Design a protein around this motif. Sequence first.
Motif, PDB file in Angstrom:
ATOM      1  N   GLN A  73       0.983  -1.192   0.118  1.00  0.00           N
ATOM      2  CA  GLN A  73      -0.065  -0.051  -0.076  1.00  0.00           C
ATOM      3  C   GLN A  73       1.048   1.175   0.009  1.00  0.00           C
ATOM      4  OE1 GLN A  73      -3.058  -0.065   3.096  1.00  0.00           O
ATOM      5  NE2 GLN A  73      -3.544  -2.304   2.580  1.00  0.00           N
ATOM      6  N   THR A  74       0.312   2.435  -0.156  1.00  0.00           N
ATOM      7  CA  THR A  74       1.028   3.509  -0.352  1.00  0.00           C
ATOM      8  C   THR A  74       0.268   4.708   0.186  1.00  0.00           C
ATOM      9  OG1 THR A  74      -0.162   3.837  -2.546  1.00  0.00           O
ATOM     10  CG2 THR A  74       2.343   3.264  -2.780  1.00  0.00           C
ATOM     11  N   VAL A  75       1.037   5.761   0.676  1.00  0.00           N
ATOM     12  CA  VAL A  75       0.433   6.984   1.154  1.00  0.00           C
ATOM     13  C   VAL A  75       1.438   8.250   0.578  1.00  0.00           C
ATOM     14  CG1 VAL A  75       1.800   6.498   3.051  1.00  0.00           C
ATOM     15  CG2 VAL A  75       0.264   8.230   3.278  1.00  0.00           C
ATOM     16  N   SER A  76       0.593   9.200   0.081  1.00  0.00           N
ATOM     17  CA  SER A  76       1.281  10.363  -0.567  1.00  0.00           C
ATOM     18  C   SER A  76       0.849  11.637   0.272  1.00  0.00           C
ATOM     19  CB  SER A  76       0.763  10.701  -1.975  1.00  0.00           C
ATOM     20  OG  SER A  76       1.297   9.287  -2.788  1.00  0.00           O
ATOM     21  N   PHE A  77       1.760  12.339   0.641  1.00  0.00           N
ATOM     22  CA  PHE A  77       1.662  13.827   1.369  1.00  0.00           C
ATOM     23  C   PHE A  77       1.250  14.803   0.273  1.00  0.00           C
ATOM     24  CE2 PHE A  77       4.258  11.540   4.379  1.00  0.00           C
ATOM     25  CZ  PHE A  77       3.524  11.693   5.566  1.00  0.00           C
ATOM     26  N   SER A  78       0.386  15.691   0.928  1.00  0.00           N
ATOM     27  CA  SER A  78      -0.259  17.007  -0.036  1.00  0.00           C
ATOM     28  C   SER A  78       0.870  18.100   0.406  1.00  0.00           C
ATOM     29  CB  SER A  78      -1.438  17.013   0.353  1.00  0.00           C
ATOM     30  OG  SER A  78      -1.815  18.231  -0.406  1.00  0.00           O
ATOM     31  N   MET A  79       1.599  18.777  -0.524  1.00  0.00           N
ATOM     32  CA  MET A  79       2.213  19.791  -0.403  1.00  0.00           C
ATOM     33  C   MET A  79       1.368  21.030  -0.334  1.00  0.00           C
ATOM     34  SD  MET A  79       4.795  18.580   0.135  1.00  0.00           S
ATOM     35  CE  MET A  79       4.736  16.805  -0.058  1.00  0.00           C
ATOM     36  N   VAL A  80       0.253  21.008  -0.893  1.00  0.00           N
ATOM     37  CA  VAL A  80      -0.787  22.187  -0.730  1.00  0.00           C
ATOM     38  C   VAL A  80      -1.327  22.408   0.652  1.00  0.00           C
ATOM     39  CG1 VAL A  80      -3.008  23.068  -1.707  1.00  0.00           C
ATOM     40  CG2 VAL A  80      -1.631  21.537  -3.095  1.00  0.00           C
ATOM     41  N   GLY A  81      -1.565  21.167   1.313  1.00  0.00           N
ATOM     42  CA  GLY A  81      -1.821  21.318   2.697  1.00  0.00           C
ATOM     43  C   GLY A  81      -0.736  21.789   3.624  1.00  0.00           C
ATOM     44  N   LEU A  82       0.536  21.259   2.994  1.00  0.00           N
ATOM     45  CA  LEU A  82       1.677  21.446   3.874  1.00  0.00           C
ATOM     46  C   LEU A  82       2.121  22.921   3.941  1.00  0.00           C
ATOM     47  CD1 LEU A  82       4.123  20.110   5.677  1.00  0.00           C
ATOM     48  CD2 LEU A  82       5.308  20.460   3.535  1.00  0.00           C
ATOM     49  N   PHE A  83       1.804  23.674   2.867  1.00  0.00           N
ATOM     50  CA  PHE A  83       2.139  24.917   2.694  1.00  0.00           C
ATOM     51  C   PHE A  83       1.086  26.100   2.785  1.00  0.00           C
ATOM     52  CE2 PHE A  83       6.043  23.692   0.320  1.00  0.00           C
ATOM     53  CZ  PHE A  83       7.089  24.057   0.897  1.00  0.00           C
ATOM     54  N   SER A  84      -0.145  25.460   2.750  1.00  0.00           N
ATOM     55  CA  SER A  84      -1.309  26.062   3.174  1.00  0.00           C
ATOM     56  C   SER A  84      -1.883  26.416   4.682  1.00  0.00           C
ATOM     57  CB  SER A  84      -2.606  25.796   2.286  1.00  0.00           C
ATOM     58  OG  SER A  84      -2.196  25.555   0.907  1.00  0.00           O
ATOM     59  N   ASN A  85      -1.720  25.141   5.406  1.00  0.00           N
ATOM     60  CA  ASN A  85      -1.994  25.097   6.837  1.00  0.00           C
ATOM     61  C   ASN A  85      -0.987  25.590   7.473  1.00  0.00           C
ATOM     62  OD1 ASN A  85      -4.264  23.794   5.132  1.00  0.00           O
ATOM     63  ND2 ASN A  85      -5.156  22.982   7.076  1.00  0.00           N
ATOM     64  N   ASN A  86      -0.194  26.583   7.241  1.00  0.00           N
ATOM     65  CA  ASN A  86       0.989  26.790   8.264  1.00  0.00           C
ATOM     66  C   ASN A  86       0.852  28.257   8.038  1.00  0.00           C
ATOM     67  OD1 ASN A  86       2.645  28.002   6.434  1.00  0.00           O
ATOM     68  ND2 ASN A  86       4.410  27.085   7.522  1.00  0.00           N
ATOM     69  N   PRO A  87       1.080  28.919   9.285  1.00  0.00           N
ATOM     70  CA  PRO A  87       0.992  30.594   9.335  1.00  0.00           C
ATOM     71  C   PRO A  87       2.335  31.199   9.248  1.00  0.00           C
ATOM     72  CG  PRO A  87       0.855  29.667  11.663  1.00  0.00           C
ATOM     73  CD  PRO A  87       1.128  28.491  10.721  1.00  0.00           C
ATOM     74  N   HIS A  88       3.362  30.227   9.420  1.00  0.00           N
ATOM     75  CA  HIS A  88       4.941  30.464   9.140  1.00  0.00           C
ATOM     76  C   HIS A  88       4.915  30.927   7.850  1.00  0.00           C
ATOM     77  CE1 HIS A  88       4.245  27.115  11.748  1.00  0.00           C
ATOM     78  NE2 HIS A  88       5.102  27.776  12.698  1.00  0.00           N
ATOM     79  N   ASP A  89       5.640  32.144   7.503  1.00  0.00           N
ATOM     80  CA  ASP A  89       6.035  32.543   6.016  1.00  0.00           C
ATOM     81  C   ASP A  89       7.452  31.906   5.787  1.00  0.00           C
ATOM     82  OD1 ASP A  89       4.461  35.957   6.227  1.00  0.00           O
ATOM     83  OD2 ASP A  89       4.000  34.434   4.654  1.00  0.00           O
ATOM     84  N   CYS A  90       7.129  30.611   5.059  1.00  0.00           N
ATOM     85  CA  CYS A  90       8.196  29.926   4.767  1.00  0.00           C
ATOM     86  C   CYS A  90       8.761  30.253   3.306  1.00  0.00           C
ATOM     87  CB  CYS A  90       8.335  28.328   4.707  1.00  0.00           C
ATOM     88  SG  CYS A  90       7.723  27.962   6.718  1.00  0.00           S
ATOM     89  N   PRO A  91      10.220  30.356   3.085  1.00  0.00           N
ATOM     90  CA  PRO A  91      10.674  30.592   1.760  1.00  0.00           C
ATOM     91  C   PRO A  91      10.010  29.589   0.881  1.00  0.00           C
ATOM     92  CG  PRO A  91      12.176  31.078   3.065  1.00  0.00           C
ATOM     93  CD  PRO A  91      11.228  30.304   3.773  1.00  0.00           C
ATOM     94  N   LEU A  92       9.721  29.842  -0.525  1.00  0.00           N
ATOM     95  CA  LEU A  92       9.429  28.814  -1.657  1.00  0.00           C
ATOM     96  C   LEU A  92      10.347  29.041  -2.784  1.00  0.00           C
ATOM     97  CD1 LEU A  92       6.830  28.166  -0.195  1.00  0.00           C
ATOM     98  CD2 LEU A  92       5.453  28.988  -1.942  1.00  0.00           C
ATOM     99  N   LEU A  93      10.770  27.906  -2.991  1.00  0.00           N
ATOM    100  CA  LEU A  93      11.804  27.747  -4.270  1.00  0.00           C
ATOM    101  C   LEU A  93      11.328  26.944  -5.468  1.00  0.00           C
ATOM    102  CD1 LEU A  93      13.665  28.148  -1.536  1.00  0.00           C
ATOM    103  CD2 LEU A  93      15.595  27.932  -3.238  1.00  0.00           C
ATOM    104  N   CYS A  94      10.772  27.502  -6.541  1.00  0.00           N
ATOM    105  CA  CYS A  94      10.318  26.734  -7.518  1.00  0.00           C
ATOM    106  C   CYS A  94      10.914  27.066  -8.708  1.00  0.00           C
ATOM    107  CB  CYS A  94       8.577  26.930  -7.582  1.00  0.00           C
ATOM    108  SG  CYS A  94       8.292  28.433  -8.680  1.00  0.00           S
ATOM    109  N   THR A  95      11.009  25.637  -9.814  1.00  0.00           N
ATOM    110  CA  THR A  95      11.207  25.680 -10.872  1.00  0.00           C
ATOM    111  C   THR A  95      10.066  25.552 -11.764  1.00  0.00           C
ATOM    112  OG1 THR A  95      13.543  24.667 -10.301  1.00  0.00           O
ATOM    113  CG2 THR A  95      12.730  24.291 -12.523  1.00  0.00           C
TER     114      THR A  95
END
Lengths: 183, 142, 226, 211
Positions: free
Chosen positions: A12-34
């Motif tokens: 079986q598998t389990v996949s984390f959601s980066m939308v939820g990781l970067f949306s449900n936090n109030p810390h302004d964390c740096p985003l680096l995207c290509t």
Amino acid sequence: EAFKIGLHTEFQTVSFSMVGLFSNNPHDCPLLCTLNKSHLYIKGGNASFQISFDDIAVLLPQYDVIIQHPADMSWCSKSDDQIWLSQWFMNAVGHDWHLDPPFLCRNRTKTEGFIFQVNTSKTGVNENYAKKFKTGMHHLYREYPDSCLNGKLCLMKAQPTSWPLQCPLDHVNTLHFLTRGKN
Amino acid sequence: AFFSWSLTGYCLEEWMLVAAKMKCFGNTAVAKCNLNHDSEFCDMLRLFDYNKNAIKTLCGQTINALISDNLLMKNKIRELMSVPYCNYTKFWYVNHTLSGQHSLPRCWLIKNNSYLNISDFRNDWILESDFLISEMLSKEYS
Amino acid sequence: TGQIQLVQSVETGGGLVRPGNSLKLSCVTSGFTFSNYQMHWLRQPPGKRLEWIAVITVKSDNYGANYVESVKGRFAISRDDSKSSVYLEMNRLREEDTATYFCSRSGIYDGYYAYAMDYWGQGTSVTVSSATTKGPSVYPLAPGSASMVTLGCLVKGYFPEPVTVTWNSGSLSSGVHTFPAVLQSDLYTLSSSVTVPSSTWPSQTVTCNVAHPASSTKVDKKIVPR
Amino acid sequence: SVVMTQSQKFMSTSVGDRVSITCKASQIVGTSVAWYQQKAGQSPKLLIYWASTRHTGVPDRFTAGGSGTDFTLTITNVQSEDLADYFCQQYATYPLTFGSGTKLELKRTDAAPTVSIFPPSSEQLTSGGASVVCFLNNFYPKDINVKWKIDGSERQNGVLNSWTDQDSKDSTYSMSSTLTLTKDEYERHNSYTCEATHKTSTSPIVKSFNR
Ligand SMILES: *[C@@H]1O[C@H](CO)[C@@H](O[C@@H]2O[C@H](CO)[C@@H](O[C@@H]3O[C@H](CO[C@H]4O[C@H](CO)[C@@H](O)[C@H](O)[C@@H]4O)[C@@H](O)[C@H](O[C@H]4O[C@H](CO)[C@@H](O)[C@H](O)[C@@H]4O)[C@@H]3O)[C@H](O)[C@H]2NC(C)=O)[C@H](O)[C@H]1NC(C)=O
Ligand SMILES: *[C@@H]1O[C@H](CO)[C@@H](O[C@@H]2O[C@H](CO)[C@@H](O[C@@H]3O[C@H](CO)[C@@H](O)[C@H](O[C@H]4O[C@H](CO)[C@@H](O)[C@H](O)[C@@H]4O)[C@@H]3O)[C@H](O)[C@H]2NC(C)=O)[C@H](O)[C@H]1NC(C)=O
Ligand SMILES: *[C@@H]1O[C@H](CO[C@@H]2O[C@@H](C)[C@@H](O)[C@@H](O)[C@@H]2O)[C@@H](O[C@@H]2O[C@H](CO)[C@@H](O[C@@H]3O[C@H](CO)[C@@H](O)[C@H](O)[C@@H]3O)[C@H](O)[C@H]2NC(C)=O)[C@H](O)[C@H]1NC(C)=O
Ligand SMILES: *[C@@H]1O[C@H](CO[C@@H]2O[C@@H](C)[C@@H](O)[C@@H](O)[C@@H]2O)[C@@H](O[C@@H]2O[C@H](CO)[C@@H](O)[C@H](O)[C@H]2NC(C)=O)[C@H](O)[C@H]1NC(C)=O
Ligand SMILES: *[C@@H]1O[C@H](CO)[C@@H](O[C@@H]2O[C@H](CO)[C@@H](O)[C@H](O)[C@H]2NC(C)=O)[C@H](O)[C@H]1NC(C)=O
């Protein structure tokens, strides 16, 4: 995705959601995207930069602000977020403010816009620095599309931009930025 | 100076997974996450747990208590050497459907921006499926 | 959206002002989101090269402005985003400010903001002089000696420009050479020549018609042989 | 300030040739250079930016190059519509500065000037002045020299010279010279001579009048 290894055990598998990781936090964390091979992006606080690499010398040492020490970046911008994100990026890529060649930014009194430029050219006496920078970019950007060819002129420019709403969220980049950013 | 976010049956919220449905993992599996800094899955769980805590109780001050720096460096070096590495995104585990006991999820590695084919790491989920059985019979005997 | 358009204008009065007075140029645009683009004012003096005057940016950068040193304290660049308009207020005007003024737009080039101008206004002529309006004096130029005969019309002592010179109300067009006016003692001087066949003159009357609108002067001077 | 130097004020060409206008900056400006076209002092037209990139809508006859201080705009297969003024600009530093300019004119076969001398009118003598005029019509090339001989003596005080641009039909130039003296100084002498020097003939062309 799942399949049966035996008749009682199951793969079986389990996949984390980066939308939820970067949306449900109030810390302004740096985003680096290509986004693609030519345009990279970095967001931090209220600052957001598009990073590009080409042979155009948008800035020249004779007319623009030479940056040799983070404090010198006070003349680059009126937004403290932009200055702080620029300093943090140059720290994360591995720029040594003591022994490395200074870089360039546009004076904040000029109205063209905020921008800063690093030589990065893999040629001649710069080749060591250009290597280190490259290595830094390989740590900050997963699958970093290196656009600077050997023996060629390849200046990097970072300028303000609206964050691409369609850029993939990669948290490994944020982790590397937070870890390497210490100094 | 332990400096490791203790998790402490662990259920994952709907916003945490792409499945959009809560998923609970047994106590015995998540107990292995405690003070283990060679599991990307445990680092991800610590990140999500710290975030869920913070929205109840500026970024990256306690980062080394959530993730393993050496494991991240390992995965980066493996990416740069063009060998499979972990994207900290998808994870796999073996589940005994009858009793519900499962193994600690491991990373599904990628190579050339694609998840490895299942066969290309079969030795891993065979061995895991072995160990699981071994630790079930050890629980039945206790 | 439609045609990119930049049209300049003088807000109060005409382009002719005396030394020491003020003058507000305006420039209204259409076809693009005016609030997203930086706007410049420049000027081209007669004979001299194009000069950059001022730039103003957008709301994100607090409508900041930059000026050349010679206009700092005298000129003021402003913008109304609601009217898609850019304005240049010029105070304490001098005779050296006589030029054709342009508004221009600057955009992004090869992915970087630069001050190359991609769109310009039509131009506004501004003349700063203390000379007084006076109609011209028209003098005929006939040869003293007797296939083709060339005659002339001299227009001296007029301000301001222009003057319209014709030959027989436009009947004589081929062989007519009207030269650029020259400024001397704050008054303008001009010469015009016409080449007519020996059959046309002095047999038939050749007359130069000079018009000065500012003084409302209409003169018809017939060229009489010597 | 950065000085953008265009040493060629005029440049002649024929339809179909290839023309190259140069520009030299007094300071190093990298590639922060633009090239513009302008006709009859109207609104300029952006042609080149970043020294080598052509603006959208510009024909592919226009190319450009250079980096540092020397920049070159090149027009291959020149058309009649391409005859205009061309100038460079740097935007590497404030103030933005432009080149003096280069006017592109049409190449033509040589022509000699038609010289015509005109004594002052009677109405002008009544007003106390005396203007002796000299027209020099339809010549090519534009390089001419004009001298004034009052009783043999060369005069330069009172000369007013007006040149016209290249005519759209015959592609020639014309010029007017004017001597503005007072009536008394005019009546002081008797003979007036307008002398022209052009490359069509080594002998200077002379037109004079008496009384
Ligand atoms: C770690 O590494 C893995 C593997 O490389 C990444 O997983 C892939 O992520 C990419 C995006 O980075 C995903 O690509 C998108 O997939 C969509 C289709 O997905 C379905 O189909 C595929 C098989 O084709 C299945 O594997 C998958 O589960 C889904 O069922 C497309 O819709 C997307 O294309 C469109 O994207 C945008 C959307 O706005 C459009 O604008 C574009 O025009 C385009 O049409 C896109 O290609 C990919 O599916 C993922 N593969 C998986 C999950 O197996 C992880 O994301 C990565 N982790 C990181 C980066 O943090
Ligand atoms: C980023 O760094 C790179 C690499 O250090 C740098 O590009 C290099 O700049 C130098 C000048 O600092 C160039 O050096 C030239 O190289 C050749 C030999 O390879 C020589 O021909 C040159 O000297 C002659 O030519 C000059 C021309 O004016 C004369 O003045 C001189 O007297 C000699 O006759 C000269 O040394 C070098 O070629 C480049 N390399 C590349 C690949 O472009 C770049 O400028 C830096 N970028 C910045 C700071 O923005
Ligand atoms: C990488 O992505 C950038 C950013 O653009 C954004 O993402 C792309 C993937 C697309 O979805 C874009 O629509 C989106 O905005 C791309 O930069 C853009 O490239 C295009 C095409 O070359 C440029 O358009 C041209 O621009 C000039 C000047 O305006 C005109 O001459 C042309 O008419 C044409 O419109 C566009 O300006 C540019 N935008 C920015 C913000 O840089 C980039 O091309 C892309 N690279 C690759 C390899 O895919
Ligand atoms: C950043 O720029 C300011 C302002 O410089 C002026 O405006 C620019 C747009 C440009 O036109 C410059 O040439 C102008 O001088 C600099 O501060 C000025 O420094 C000058 C002398 O260099 C001095 O006469 C002014 O008083 C200063 N103005 C202010 C407001 O302090 C400043 O030095 C520049 N920073 C760097 C790091 O170079
Ligand atoms: C392992 O498999 C079991 C059996 O399918 C899963 O537990 C079941 O969960 C469903 C809801 O999804 C319940 O209705 C069943 O009653 C459960 N069966 C049990 C507890 O025996 C279990 O979720 C799986 N484990 C993981 C980690 O996915």
